Design an enzyme around this catalytic site. Sequence first.
Site, PDB file in Angstrom:
ATOM      1  N   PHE A  15     -18.933 -10.985  -5.871  1.00  0.00           N
ATOM      2  CA  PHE A  15     -17.764  -9.907  -5.964  1.00  0.00           C
ATOM      3  C   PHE A  15     -16.979 -10.706  -5.707  1.00  0.00           C
ATOM      4  O   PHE A  15     -16.677 -11.517  -5.599  1.00  0.00           O
ATOM      5  CB  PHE A  15     -18.031  -8.952  -4.679  1.00  0.00           C
ATOM      6  N   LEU A  29     -14.680   5.700 -10.702  1.00  0.00           N
ATOM      7  CA  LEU A  29     -15.042   4.626 -11.100  1.00  0.00           C
ATOM      8  C   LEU A  29     -16.543   4.223 -11.634  1.00  0.00           C
ATOM      9  O   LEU A  29     -17.689   4.426 -10.523  1.00  0.00           O
ATOM     10  CB  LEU A  29     -15.191   4.128  -9.102  1.00  0.00           C
ATOM     11  N   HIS A  31      -7.852  -0.506  -9.694  1.00  0.00           N
ATOM     12  CA  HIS A  31      -9.087  -1.573 -10.334  1.00  0.00           C
ATOM     13  C   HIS A  31      -9.276  -1.392 -11.632  1.00  0.00           C
ATOM     14  O   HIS A  31      -8.622  -0.401 -12.637  1.00  0.00           O
ATOM     15  CB  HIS A  31     -10.198  -0.214  -9.545  1.00  0.00           C
ATOM     16  N   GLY A  78     -19.847  -2.985  -1.622  1.00  0.00           N
ATOM     17  CA  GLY A  78     -20.280  -2.972  -0.555  1.00  0.00           C
ATOM     18  C   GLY A  78     -19.283  -3.697   0.847  1.00  0.00           C
ATOM     19  O   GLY A  78     -17.553  -3.359  -0.145  1.00  0.00           O
ATOM     20  N   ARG A 116      -5.849  -6.266  -2.397  1.00  0.00           N
ATOM     21  CA  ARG A 116      -7.363  -6.725  -1.304  1.00  0.00           C
ATOM     22  C   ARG A 116      -8.293  -7.083  -2.220  1.00  0.00           C
ATOM     23  O   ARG A 116      -8.340  -6.655  -3.301  1.00  0.00           O
ATOM     24  CB  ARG A 116      -7.552  -4.469  -1.457  1.00  0.00           C
ATOM     25  N   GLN A 156      -2.315  -0.793  -5.528  1.00  0.00           N
ATOM     26  CA  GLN A 156      -3.813  -2.059  -6.570  1.00  0.00           C
ATOM     27  C   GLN A 156      -4.616  -0.718  -7.565  1.00  0.00           C
ATOM     28  O   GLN A 156      -5.211   0.136  -7.275  1.00  0.00           O
ATOM     29  CB  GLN A 156      -5.316  -1.885  -5.307  1.00  0.00           C
ATOM     30  N   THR A 165     -18.072   0.688 -10.348  1.00  0.00           N
ATOM     31  CA  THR A 165     -18.047  -0.468  -9.502  1.00  0.00           C
ATOM     32  C   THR A 165     -17.822  -1.687 -10.135  1.00  0.00           C
ATOM     33  O   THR A 165     -18.453  -2.069 -11.420  1.00  0.00           O
ATOM     34  CB  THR A 165     -19.316  -0.505  -8.343  1.00  0.00           C
ATOM     35  N   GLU A 166     -17.577  -3.264  -9.277  1.00  0.00           N
ATOM     36  CA  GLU A 166     -16.680  -4.406  -9.468  1.00  0.00           C
ATOM     37  C   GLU A 166     -18.629  -5.146  -9.273  1.00  0.00           C
ATOM     38  O   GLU A 166     -18.811  -6.132 -10.185  1.00  0.00           O
ATOM     39  CB  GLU A 166     -16.054  -4.791  -8.673  1.00  0.00           C
ATOM     40  N   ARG A 189      -8.835  -8.163  -8.987  1.00  0.00           N
ATOM     41  CA  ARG A 189      -8.520  -7.288  -9.332  1.00  0.00           C
ATOM     42  C   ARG A 189      -7.107  -6.631 -10.446  1.00  0.00           C
ATOM     43  O   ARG A 189      -7.258  -6.704 -11.564  1.00  0.00           O
ATOM     44  CB  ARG A 189      -8.924  -6.012  -8.566  1.00  0.00           C
ATOM     45  N   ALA A 198     -13.372   4.073   9.434  1.00  0.00           N
ATOM     46  CA  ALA A 198     -12.300   3.397  10.007  1.00  0.00           C
ATOM     47  C   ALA A 198     -11.806   5.040  11.537  1.00  0.00           C
ATOM     48  O   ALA A 198     -13.033   4.414  12.042  1.00  0.00           O
ATOM     49  CB  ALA A 198     -10.543   3.276  10.025  1.00  0.00           C
TER      50      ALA A 198
HETATM   51  C1  LIG Z   1     -14.246   4.805  -5.855  1.00  0.00           C
HETATM   52  C2  LIG Z   1     -14.193   3.681  -4.347  1.00  0.00           C
HETATM   53  C3  LIG Z   1     -15.056   3.112  -4.281  1.00  0.00           C
HETATM   54  C4  LIG Z   1     -14.668   2.295  -2.840  1.00  0.00           C
HETATM   55  N1  LIG Z   1     -15.602   0.750  -2.978  1.00  0.00           N
HETATM   56  C5  LIG Z   1     -15.647   0.411  -2.094  1.00  0.00           C
HETATM   57  C6  LIG Z   1     -16.445  -1.295  -1.809  1.00  0.00           C
HETATM   58  O1  LIG Z   1     -17.456  -1.164  -2.259  1.00  0.00           O
HETATM   59  N2  LIG Z   1     -16.211  -2.257  -0.837  1.00  0.00           N
HETATM   60  C7  LIG Z   1     -14.790  -1.687   0.277  1.00  0.00           C
HETATM   61  O2  LIG Z   1     -14.950  -2.423   1.198  1.00  0.00           O
HETATM   62  N3  LIG Z   1     -14.203  -0.855   0.004  1.00  0.00           N
HETATM   63  C8  LIG Z   1     -14.108   0.311  -0.848  1.00  0.00           C
HETATM   64  N4  LIG Z   1     -13.259   1.065  -1.359  1.00  0.00           N
HETATM   65  C9  LIG Z   1     -12.201   1.395  -0.639  1.00  0.00           C
HETATM   66  C10 LIG Z   1     -12.468   2.228   0.694  1.00  0.00           C
HETATM   67  O3  LIG Z   1     -14.080   2.828   0.330  1.00  0.00           O
HETATM   68  C11 LIG Z   1     -11.322   3.031   1.482  1.00  0.00           C
HETATM   69  O4  LIG Z   1     -10.260   2.824   1.079  1.00  0.00           O
HETATM   70  C12 LIG Z   1     -12.077   3.260   3.148  1.00  0.00           C
HETATM   71  O5  LIG Z   1     -13.204   4.271   2.828  1.00  0.00           O
HETATM   72  C13 LIG Z   1     -10.955   4.515   3.448  1.00  0.00           C
HETATM   73  O6  LIG Z   1     -11.455   4.825   4.545  1.00  0.00           O
HETATM   74  P1  LIG Z   1     -10.303   5.259   6.159  1.00  0.00           P
HETATM   75  O7  LIG Z   1     -11.514   5.864   7.142  1.00  0.00           O
HETATM   76  O8  LIG Z   1      -8.951   4.119   6.303  1.00  0.00           O
HETATM   77  O9  LIG Z   1     -10.085   6.441   5.002  1.00  0.00           O
HETATM   78  P2  LIG Z   1     -11.195   7.491   3.740  1.00  0.00           P
HETATM   79  O10 LIG Z   1     -12.439   7.437   4.417  1.00  0.00           O
HETATM   80  O11 LIG Z   1     -10.540   7.896   2.937  1.00  0.00           O
HETATM   81  O12 LIG Z   1     -10.798   9.031   4.946  1.00  0.00           O
HETATM   82  C14 LIG Z   1      -9.918   9.600   5.143  1.00  0.00           C
HETATM   83  C15 LIG Z   1     -10.242  10.820   6.305  1.00  0.00           C
HETATM   84  O13 LIG Z   1      -8.785  11.085   7.037  1.00  0.00           O
HETATM   85  C16 LIG Z   1      -9.109  12.738   6.741  1.00  0.00           C
HETATM   86  N5  LIG Z   1      -7.364  13.405   6.638  1.00  0.00           N
HETATM   87  C17 LIG Z   1      -6.531  13.250   5.497  1.00  0.00           C
HETATM   88  N6  LIG Z   1      -5.722  13.943   5.523  1.00  0.00           N
HETATM   89  C18 LIG Z   1      -5.931  14.941   6.209  1.00  0.00           C
HETATM   90  C19 LIG Z   1      -5.702  15.222   7.591  1.00  0.00           C
HETATM   91  N7  LIG Z   1      -3.565  16.212   6.847  1.00  0.00           N
HETATM   92  N8  LIG Z   1      -5.818  15.747   8.655  1.00  0.00           N
HETATM   93  C20 LIG Z   1      -6.994  15.452   9.440  1.00  0.00           C
HETATM   94  N9  LIG Z   1      -7.745  13.881   9.245  1.00  0.00           N
HETATM   95  C21 LIG Z   1      -7.189  13.808   7.779  1.00  0.00           C
HETATM   96  C22 LIG Z   1     -10.050  13.061   5.646  1.00  0.00           C
HETATM   97  O14 LIG Z   1     -10.532  14.364   6.294  1.00  0.00           O
HETATM   98  C23 LIG Z   1     -10.895  11.931   6.311  1.00  0.00           C
HETATM   99  O15 LIG Z   1     -11.517  12.168   6.669  1.00  0.00           O
HETATM  100  C24 LIG Z   1     -13.929   2.575  -2.649  1.00  0.00           C
HETATM  101  C25 LIG Z   1     -12.489   3.522  -2.856  1.00  0.00           C
HETATM  102  C26 LIG Z   1     -13.045   3.866  -3.341  1.00  0.00           C
HETATM  103  C27 LIG Z   1     -11.789   4.963  -4.254  1.00  0.00           C
END
Ligand SMILES: Cc1cc2nc3c(=O)[nH]c(=O)nc-3n(C[C@H](O)[C@H](O)[C@H](O)COP(=O)(O)OP(=O)(O)OC[C@H]3O[C@@H](n4cnc5c(N)ncnc54)[C@H](O)[C@@H]3O)c2cc1C
Lengths: 616, 152, 129, 250
Positions: free
Chosen positions: A124, A257, A247, A57, A403, A245, A259-260, A291, A23
């Site tokens: 998936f 984890l 898994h 994915g 999700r 959620q 994967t699914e 899930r 994001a």
């Molecule tokens: C094992 C696993 C496998 C997954 N596989 C899939 C998949 O195959 N497909 C799918 O669609 N989704 C998947 N997900 C879900 C998905 O990957 C995550 O929910 C998604 O990556 C979140 O992205 P994000 O940028 O919101 O937060 P994240 O990618 O979790 O990153 C968080 C960011 O916020 C920052 N941050 C946190 N707290 C602070 C703070 N106090 N100050 C400054 N920075 C901070 C961190 O440093 C980091 O940079 C998976 C999740 C897991 C755990």
Amino acid sequence: SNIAQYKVIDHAYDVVIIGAGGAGLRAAMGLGEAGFKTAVVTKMFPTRSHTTAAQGGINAALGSMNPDDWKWHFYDTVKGSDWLGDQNAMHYLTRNAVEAVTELENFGMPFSRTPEGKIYQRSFGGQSNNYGKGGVAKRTCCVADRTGHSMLHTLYGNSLRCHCTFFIEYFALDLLMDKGRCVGVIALCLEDGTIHRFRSKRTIVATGGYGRAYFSCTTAHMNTGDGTALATRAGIALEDLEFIQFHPTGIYGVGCLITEGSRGEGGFLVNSEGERFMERYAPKAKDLASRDVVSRAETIEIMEGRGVGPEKDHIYLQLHHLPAEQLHQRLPGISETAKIFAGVDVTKEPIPVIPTVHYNMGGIPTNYKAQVIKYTKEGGDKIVPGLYACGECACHSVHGANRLGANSLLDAVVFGRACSINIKEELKPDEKIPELPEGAGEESIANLDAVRYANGDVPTAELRLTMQKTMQKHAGVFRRGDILAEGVKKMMDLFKELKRLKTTDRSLIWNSDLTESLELQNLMLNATQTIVAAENRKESRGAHARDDFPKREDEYDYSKPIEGQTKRPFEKHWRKHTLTKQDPRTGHITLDYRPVIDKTLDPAEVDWIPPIIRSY
Amino acid sequence: EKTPIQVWGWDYLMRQRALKRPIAPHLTIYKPQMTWMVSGLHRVTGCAMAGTLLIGGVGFSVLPLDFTTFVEFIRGLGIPWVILDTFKFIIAFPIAFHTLNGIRFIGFDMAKGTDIPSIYRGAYLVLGLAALISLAVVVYPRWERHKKATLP
Amino acid sequence: TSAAVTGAAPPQFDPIAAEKGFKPLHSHGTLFKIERYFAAAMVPLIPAAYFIHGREMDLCLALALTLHVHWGVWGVVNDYGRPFVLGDTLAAAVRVGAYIFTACLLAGLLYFNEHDVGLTRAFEMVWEL
Amino acid sequence: KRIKTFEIYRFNPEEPGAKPKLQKFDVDLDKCGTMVLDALIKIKNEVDPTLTFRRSCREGICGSCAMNIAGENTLACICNIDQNTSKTTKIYPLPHMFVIKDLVPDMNLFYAQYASIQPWLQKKTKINLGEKQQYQSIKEQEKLDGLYECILCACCSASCPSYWWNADKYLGPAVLMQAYRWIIDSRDDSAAERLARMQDGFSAFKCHTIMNCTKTCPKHLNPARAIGEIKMLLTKMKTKPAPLPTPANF
Ligand SMILES: Cc1cc2nc3c(=O)[nH]c(=O)nc-3n(C[C@H](O)[C@H](O)[C@H](O)COP(=O)(O)OP(=O)(O)OC[C@H]3O[C@@H](n4cnc5c(N)ncnc54)[C@H](O)[C@@H]3O)c2cc1C
Ligand code: HEM
Ligand SMILES: O=C(Nc1cccc(-c2ccccc2)c1)c1ccccc1C(F)(F)F
Ligand code: SF4
Ligand code: F3S
Ligand code: FES
């Protein structure tokens, strides 16, 4: 800030992003490309964010394997939400899905390929062709088993090309609030122990989830819900927290984890009897059911004494019936992971797996444009100016109560880009960068100092270890009103022990004792709100099941035909978003409820999908 | 004349200096492995020969002493044959090893044989053939001088 | 309180700001090729000199070894003769002393072959011990 | 009870006139997880909270927790503790890096250098960013196998002696292998100009094929080969194939 002195430093940016996950970066890319002076604040190097650990994915109807319609994706998305999902935001997501993922490939994301030379898609969980009537869908684009690693790395690379100035290993402390407006973030730079206020017109929150609120999870050590804690302290009510959620296939001993995608290739779940039991709980979709359905299925077989292993307390995922060629080409990552942690050759034995905490569909409530909101009964949707949020930490809400697999990486890239687009167009070069109110961030610093020097009689690890344990016991897969009630009780007591806190490391410079204690306040906020919101939801919807309230409570009863009934009042049914609002100091919480946006964005482009019985 | 990163990279060192941060130990802590001991050797030998050639070439020129009186001198010490063929082995092994391992490295420069087994065979094969060749060049003429001494 | 200074962006490399006015360095590629080719071509020379001795060999070793060891020590000097630990001009002194080492190596070798037994004959005589 | 001992490199830059130190720690192996990261955490939680080190993912994918365990550079989280309780496992940080605190090395050159290869996709003909996929065959993209899985942990850069002595000029194994992954990417038009920023005799040619990088890499990848490969191109002993032509029905 009594008992010490703190260097402070002021910056001035157009927009300050708190996050370097999928994001965050994707947002930041958009903003720099459009010539904003963007800061990216993150508590770790962006490659380390959780996105990297995603495997399965990212969904887009590319028709690289069989003809697809983004509307069938839209269908499955809403079904998966369990009609708690705001259908406008699900619309935006699924529509822009094919563009978003193509952008990635164009950014240089090394996707797996077909013989025709297009993006390879795998099956998936939860998805299907022709509005639930067709077969099992195939739109989950992947880079084998390491799709998040590849997406984040690609994203990170491209962010260096577009002039975002990165503030790395800066722990964000609080939002800078000026009577209802967000003017920036205050943070602790770990390298040199200074404190940093950033002034900015906009602020995007992109800080991931709070999986470390439980004793077992798939999530990273950094997943501590700092963003929702940021919003809580800034007086913003969080949404849908009670939907955690689970898994189905997390590794038994460790949490890592599987994967699914391992089931989307052909692998399946097996109990002690050797039955491929999912065919009972879901005759049509079997091991590729949603899930929450699968996780419960497993959690039953355990409770009914058909669990596998020494304790008869987990399940097997069976992969050794597949070709070895396909296990290398599609699942090299987990082939390895199972080897390291479970001591398993996936081509010859099964992996021991058990339902495990994973995602948070709850988060900071927003609109479809990603503008963080507030809600009262009378005024309604009231945006918080300057503030946006996206990804796991948000609640758009595109996942409602469950999700869909491979929809978070999408949510991240779509609504990340949506923040940049929706800021390029409401922010115009006339508007200058806000000035800070005097005394801004002073209390964040006061808190910092109090925690840093604190000398209570309970250490910061112990208080956490039980918060996590309490949550695993009282707020798990199946929940009961009395267990939850005791849960809230026990939980509210641990919120008081936070005054009796004990830290040792006194330093400003790279103090990982102090920062893991700021994480623990941030967890406690998120945790307490999660369990009360849950204890009050007397229904069973998506990833939330009450033994004592097993039915889905909607406006009508959607099991019988519609015309003939009377629409129950809003206060009686439960098709609505829970809104927790907490007082950070006292720990008292209050509730309120918000209607589900059922209309789509554009009636022409696609009709809304009215609720039905949810069976896979 | 540097690249921009090499410029940036310098200034970074200067910063880390200014902050007086320590440098994490390396030689003193890193595990001995075939990969870098062999490279170590390859250099150590390569250099020692050059060193010998400079200390040799310039040494006899800048002194009144010549090579014949030097060889003459040490035969005059009456030192056991075993010790003298060890000192020959130590002269051969450097030239043998460095030359064999030279080709190996020309391999690695062209990506050939870079997997972890090819690295560990290439290593033993070289230490093997080089020790083999250095014994073969010391003991053969010593076995062909014990024929003149004792045979008809 | 917060009565603080306006601070600056952290030090950070821009690979696009770097691309303005940067003009590629003369390529080292061609040279690396001949260094190694030359070493490859010496592979038959060492065994050649085991069997065949005399003054024409002595001369071809001295010429080859010099040119090889010239490029050898230049690389070894550039590794251990670092500005960050010797300071600028002392490190440049070591780079110059590399070209001295190369030209004293030869003179001594050429001397040795022209006014002494030679490289091959010198080896013979220690093997006659 | 099996009580295992760990000698852990320590340093604190706030104590005035500070010096690095070794600190022994005793850990009950039966009260503790299998992997070395599990011990560091245990020790931080139960014995010494000051003990500072990076971590995030628990599954060996992030690269945060790189350090020198028992002589070798590896990730702590997938590192099985040596249960032979007679010996003591030595834990220092990534070799030859400026340390910030304890097991936490300033990783900022390593990152800047990764930026300097320009790790992104570059096209001669301006593409319309969201419009269609770029063709790439299976074989073309399997070139990327062994390369795109780099987690940027720095184990290998920090194990190469050349990079110890010349971090400031030599890019080192991890950044160089990544440089090669954007070079053999069929989709990348800039193969030409990419090699132009490692022309000099220090950027990529300071690889003296020691082979420490490929040996230590906890992800079982191979930079020594990618570097070797990068030279030829520099030499011209090789060049990059032109992209396979994208079919017109695509
Ligand atoms: C094992 C696993 C496998 C997954 N596989 C899939 C998949 O195959 N497909 C799918 O669609 N989704 C998947 N997900 C879900 C998905 O990957 C995550 O929910 C998604 O990556 C979140 O992205 P994000 O940028 O919101 O937060 P994240 O990618 O979790 O990153 C968080 C960011 O916020 C920052 N941050 C946190 N707290 C602070 C703070 N106090 N100050 C400054 N920075 C901070 C961190 O440093 C980091 O940079 C998976 C999740 C897991 C755990
Ligand atoms: C006969 C075949 C030979 C071959 C194929 C050969 C090959 C090589 C190669 C490839 C290198 C560079 C390796 C690196 O960069 O680490 C090297 C270095 C060197 N060689 Fe040779 N060599 C040979 C003979 C000799 C001889 C006879 C000497 C005599 C003094 C010598 C002295 C050196 C020195 C001093 C280096 C220094 C560079 C370093 O160690 O890194 N070599 N050789
Ligand atoms: O320095 C080199 N070996 C070296 C020199 C000094 C110490 C150590 C060492 C010691 C213990 C553990 C690991 C390395 C290694 C070396 C050897 C051959 C080629 C290039 C080099 C180098 F590039 F200059 F690094
Ligand atoms: S190569 Fe192996 S070691 Fe070097 S970074 Fe990529 S992963 Fe870490
Ligand atoms: S450890 Fe070092 S010098 Fe080259 S091949 Fe490997 S990088
Ligand atoms: S913390 Fe991810 S590498 Fe171990």
